Swiss-Prot record, chains A, B:
The lineage of its organism: Bacteria, Bacillati, Actinomycetota, Actinomycetes, Mycobacteriales. Binds 1 Mg(2+) ion per subunit. This ion is required for catalysis, binding to the active site transiently (at the TMP-binding site), and probably acting as a clamp between the phosphoryl donor and acceptor. Residues 147-159 are annotated as: LID. It catalyses: dTMP + ATP = dTDP + ADP. Keywords: ATP-binding, Kinase, Magnesium, Metal-binding, Nucleotide biosynthesis, Nucleotide-binding, Transferase. It is an enzyme of class 2 (transferase). GO terms for molecular function: ATP binding; dTMP kinase activity; metal ion binding. Belongs to the thymidylate kinase family. Homodimer. This is Thymidylate kinase. InterPro entries: P-loop_NTPase, Thymidylate_kin-like_dom, Thymidylate_kin_CS, Thymidylate_kinase. DTMP binds at D9, Y39, F70, R74, R95, N100, Y103, D163, Y165.
Length: 208, 208
């Protein structure tokens, strides 16, 4: 089974991933995890990160260019995803194809039914062959609370300064609204919306 | 030996490549050839082409985004280049790293000493590890004559319509001027400037 954890920056995805993986393991299932962007593992992922922190000229100014780098990152991990799925019972991902739809739609002030989300659909799933997730969990959180966690993370960790997207409070709010639409739409597969208080044991029972 | 054939669109590079490869073979050396962008062989190369023909939203509007896709294309062919160099005596390329410097510098109205050309240097050679060419041949031609060949190619071949760069006569002229600077500078390795009348036999003797 392939599970994707989605949400805005500072929503608390990586933590939910560690709590979830533990719950599945306390249930007897082997678990594997992968996080996108795969920093350090692919040039596409790295150039993208550097671009969000101000490098590579006008790269980050193009909404479609950024989406492409993130998609090229995933395209390079297809065999790896399939391998993990064959050998493990559960595979949890920290962000997946839906992040590209939500952020791209939000940067262009479009909704989940817009052209950007449809573009991601056509390129990543149909063309690049990334397998659709069995489940997509949306850790819904107030934009204010999320931004607060992102700002705190930057204050206490020099190698964790916020990037362009994280400094745009408006983009984070719109992205939140697009995510909520994607879920109700069942975009790319079935979704499950949870909050900060979601119980890891029950949650893992819903996804089992 | 690694040889790169550079020049503006319609300069006549592919033809010089077929005439050159024949001259080396008539000299007893095995020859191998590769052309960039590697259309059909890599997603990066294909998205780039589609973008130049009007697809993928605002992608082609970013100078650095296009340069990145072309570089990602090459990055994926490094092992292939090295393999060809080990097994063959001569390897001729239809366009290589210098095209990214010339076109990028020209789109930004910079010269060969500008930041764009320096960026390509840092990312493709130093970071991605593409081997520098032993020789870089610049097929210098009048911008007018080149554009004339590009327009004729489009009239007689439906699958050969000009792309964005080819329709910009001003970009083609500036790109020509940047190329001439790159050569005099010996950018990326030694250069050889030739014209339409260059003799394939002698030329191949200079590169032998
Ligand atoms: O496909 C994507 N599209 C996309 O826009 N992103 C965004 C989310 C962030 O602002 C950034 C990477 O974020 P992070 O390292 O916090 O997961 O890029 C991330 C991905 C996944 O790679
Ligand atoms: O690195 C590059 N940078 C770059 O700007 N180009 C340009 C030249 C063209 O206008 C186009 C591809 O051209 P062509 O198929 O005629 O070789 O992209 C081509 C390459 C090589 O890939
Ligand atoms: Mg982030
Ligand atoms: Mg061309």
């Amino acid at each position: 089974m392939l599970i994707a954890i989605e949400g805005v920056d500072g929503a608390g995805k990586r933590t939910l991933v560690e709590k979830l993986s533990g719950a599945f393991r306390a249930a007897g299932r082997s678990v594997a995890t992968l996080a996108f962007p795969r920093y350090g593992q692919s040039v596409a992922a790295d150039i993208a990160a550097e671009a969000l922190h101000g490098e590579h000229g006008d790269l980050a100014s193009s909404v479609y260019a950024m989406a492409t780098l993130f998609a090229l990152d995933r395209a390079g991990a297809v065999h790896t995803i399939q391998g993990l799925c064959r050998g493990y019972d559960v595979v949890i991902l920290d962000r997946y194809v839906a992040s590209n739809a939500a952020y791209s739609a939000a940067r262009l002030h479009e909704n989940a039914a817009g052209k950007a989300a449809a573009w991601v659909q056509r390129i990543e799933f149909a063309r690049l062959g990334l397998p659709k997730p069995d489940w997509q969990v949306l850790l819904a959180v107030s934009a204010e609370l999320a931004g607060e966690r992102s700002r705190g993370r930057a204050q206490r960790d020099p190698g964790r300064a916020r990037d362009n997207y994280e400094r745009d409070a408006e983009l984070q709010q719109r992205t939140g609204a697009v995510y909520a639409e994607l879920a109700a739409q069942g975009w790319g597969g079935r979704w499950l919306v949870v909050g900060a208080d979601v119980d890891p044991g029950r949650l893992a029972a819903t996804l089992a």
